[PDB]
Design a binder for this molecule. Structure first.
Ligand code: HEM
Ligand code: HEM
Ligand SMILES: Cc1cc(N)nc(CCc2cc(CCCN(C)C)cc(F)c2F)c1
Ligand SMILES: Cc1cc(N)nc(CCc2cc(CCCN(C)C)cc(F)c2F)c1
Ligand SMILES: C[C@H](O)[C@H](O)[C@H]1CNc2nc(N)[nH]c(=O)c2N1
Ligand SMILES: C[C@H](O)[C@H](O)[C@H]1CNc2nc(N)[nH]c(=O)c2N1
Ligand SMILES: [Zn+2]
Lengths: 407, 411
């Protein structure tokens, strides 16, 4: 019940006391571990609010103080009255920073305290949402000196007036199924690209077309907006040794900005809460470029490298994979766009884990997600035992809006 | 109940019913997942249910469930338990049990081969010398001049826990490690503590970088005894690279036979504390872990130095680049010497086919994603994208404490 995690590369042992404060369920039981599964009223609300305010006033060292008890009473009064409540700006910032702090699948959490929170709870329309998102994108991009940010739209009320960004990420490339049978652009976005066209978009039908925003305010039908191209910082991908690499015609965008998750703070649900940081190189070079269900460029790159692709045991995929990821990192660094390699990021996370175990009693972590998708065991996180549990405030998945929208 | 797993690369969805036959714990609760934790004396009281369940599974598999043979065997095992406090497996049941322990090993990516396992019954063994002979015959048979064959040798089961058979080596073939006074390590740093034991037990150590450790063998709970595996039985492969002529001058080799010897085989409640088993290597076990773990031979720096990679900043991925070349070299060398090896692409693709086949014919395939995904190039192998359910079936291989931590020495 007071659990130990061992690093097998260093024999360092950490004692986890923080998991005792876990709340939500993992999907695992004593009989079955679901560690690798991707997606496992007034009465409920005040306990949730109390739990959150308790940790908030603890964190400002005012637990049990007059202002603590007064705030508890005031929120208790507001819930009994209005059946919901509103967060103080200070509680919103704390809650968002801690939702990131608690994201067990996120390797970049050493940065959790340096998050810019943009309060958009006064937003009422999709044009207003667009304005807030443009400002977010511009602030976060910062001419390539990327800065972590989240923009928080009004919280769910009766579930009929939900704010939603229909895009999975603020910036993503379109996908189109060809008549010739293959897929042009990003195959992961084929369905969303269709819903954009099915709603009015004029697709360039290119290979790297930045999708438009599909913004839903107050439960209304979503609306299309093109992000000003001058706000979308892209990096052409070249290799520091292979001159032919540029001819592949590859590029990626600088800003990873997740926009389809649900932020839960003190029982309140923020269905529209796009957040952004900066890329770890493998997200682009390993997953975006080399997944078979994505841009799937391994064969082409290996061909240009003249590797023996007859036998898998030549490890031509592995060689091509390394070179692609060298190019991504080289390209972003050359254009002075913030990026972190998986070696630096995972070393940071170990440092962060040691920091969290010391100053917080633990750090929930999902090994399946934390270990990078290449070169796993030469990064320190591979040898790090991790305890996965759900702390709140939290980011949660939610259904895709088109499956839900009472049209 | 029914459980679904999804492959996110292919959208294939499979339905697991086999998890309903799970018994042991995982370590996880509704409140905590212990999926990345490495490591999560038995009376007649619990033994006959464990026996009966195993015998039900056995007779079901041979399409004789409820037969007179099945009922007689239950009766015979029952009386043997209450009369003798244990029981003996028939040869057929031991073979079935050992194959199914492998089949049930959720951390093993090589399980497509589970039904082709050579079982050597060593339950008549009584002395460390007898153990040495059986293990030599295992090594010779499994090596097969490089055409490796899977095998397991099963020594007498535990009785009162005071007469255990144990192989003190973690693996039958492993290189020594020696901590130098200056703090550096000669040889395999993983084996330093075991090497010191062997030396203390009288092994004359050559003190090189690739010294095959002696076998340290404990029969019937007696003090363990040192034996040298005949060198002609130890197949080794010098490591060279197909393009880099300087790679051979690194002086690396490895042994061909991966033979785990420290695990416990549980069949029908019986505990076989000494059950060495062997198959063939997946290249990454050597090229990634053995050679490139910081706590092992740790050759990335020297390989990257010889490649003249940019080693000043990690973002050059000089480590990843050297890792691939080292793993090309291991695979090239084993193939060139005609020693069975499998690359991680082939192994993972076969495992997916095996897993799909198990879902169809068996209702599931327990699998530990954390261990199944290879330690390099994770997401370009099909297992990375495969959801997996981990649960414990018996028969099973289990960890047991290291024998030097528990042995009562005779002197
Ligand atoms: C600043 C640098 C950051 C880095 C390097 C980083 C890195 C990563 C990576 C590599 C993943 C794996 C996800 C995938 O492979 O698709 C991830 C997941 C995640 N990140 Fe971070 N991230 C950063 C910033 C942030 C911020 C600012 C937030 C929220 C405020 C956040 C919240 C999350 C969450 C919730 C997940 C998991 C979501 C899911 O399960 O799909 N991250 N991060
Ligand atoms: C024949 C080809 C085989 C291949 C390619 C193979 C491959 C592997 C690999 C790569 C691992 C993880 C090893 C590590 O990282 O330490 C593993 C684990 C395991 N293998 Fe297999 N194996 C094979 C045969 C066998 C056999 C014959 C048995 C038993 C009869 C077996 C039982 C196990 C068990 C019990 C584990 C769990 C290891 C643990 O928890 O420490 N394997 N296998
Ligand atoms: C802020 C930030 C920084 C950074 N470096 N990367 C990212 C992308 C990571 C990511 C991806 C997904 C998609 C999940 C579905 N996908 C598995 C198919 C959902 C997330 F909430 C998430 F954070 C974000
Ligand atoms: C038969 C076979 C084939 C193959 N290819 N490889 C292997 C080695 C795999 C392995 C290793 C370990 C020690 C784990 C050390 N770790 C816990 C720190 C224990 C095992 F039971 C096991 F099977 C075996
Ligand atoms: C902490 C973590 O569980 C540990 O490093 C595991 C990860 N996965 C592994 N996978 C394999 N095949 N072998 C290992 O030794 C490990 N080690
Ligand atoms: C099935 C498996 O859980 C799935 O492929 C996971 C594995 N680990 C991952 N890890 C990260 N960081 N991102 C991912 O999308 C995934 N996918
Ligand atoms: Zn679990």
């Amino acid at each position: 019940r007071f659990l130990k995690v061992k690093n097998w590369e260093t024999d360092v042992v950490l004692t986890d006391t923080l998991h005792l404060k876990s709340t939500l369920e993992t999907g695992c039981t004593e009989h079955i571990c679901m560690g690798s599964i991707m997606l496992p009223t007034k009465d409920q609300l005040f306990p949730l609010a109390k739990e959150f305010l308790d940790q908030y006033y603890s964190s400002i060292k005012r637990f049990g103080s007059k202002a603590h008890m007064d705030r508890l009473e005031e929120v208790n009064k507001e819930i009994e009255s209005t059946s919901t409540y509103q967060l103080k700006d200070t509680e919103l910032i704390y809650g968002a920073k801690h939702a990131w702090r608690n994201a067990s699948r996120c390797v970049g959490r050493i940065q959790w305290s340096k998050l810019q929170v943009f309060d958009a709870r006064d937003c009422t329309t999709a044009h207003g949402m667009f304005n807030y998102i443009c400002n977010h994108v511009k602030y976060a991009t910062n001419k390539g000196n990327l800065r972590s940010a989240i923009t928080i739209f009004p919280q769910r009320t009766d579930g009929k007036h939900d704010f939603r960004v229909w895009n999975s990420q603020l910036i993503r490339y379109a996908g189109y199924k060809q008549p010739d049978g293959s897929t042009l652009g990003d195959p992961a976005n084929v369905q969303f690209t269709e819903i954009c066209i099915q709603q009015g978009w004029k697709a360039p039908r290119g290979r790297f077309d930045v999708l438009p925003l599909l913004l839903q305010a107050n439960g209304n039908d979503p609306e299309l907006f093109q992000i000003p191209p001058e706000l979308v910082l892209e990096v052409p991908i070249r290799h520091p040794k292979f001159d032919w690499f540029k001819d592949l015609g590859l590029k990626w965008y600088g800003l990873p900005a997740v926009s389809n998750m649900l932020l839960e703070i003190g029982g309140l649900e923020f269905s529209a809460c796009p957040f952004s940081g900066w890329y770890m190189g493998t997200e682009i070079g390993v997953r975006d470029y080399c997944d078979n269900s994505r841009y799937n460029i391994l064969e082409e790159v290996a061909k240009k490298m003249d590797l023996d692709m007859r036998k898998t045991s030549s490890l031509w995929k592995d060689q091509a994979l390394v070179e692609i990821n060298i190019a991504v990192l080289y390209s972003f660094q050359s254009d002075k766009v913030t990026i972190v390699d998986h070696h630096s990021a995972t070393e940071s996370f170990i440092k962060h884990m040691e920091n969290e175990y010391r100053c917080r009693g633990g750090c929930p972590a999902d090994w399946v997600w934390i270990v990078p998708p290449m070169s796993g065991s030469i990064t320190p996180v591979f040898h790090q035992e991790m305890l996965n549990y759900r702390l709140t405030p939290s980011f949660e998945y939610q259904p895709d809006p088109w499956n839900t929208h009472v049209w």
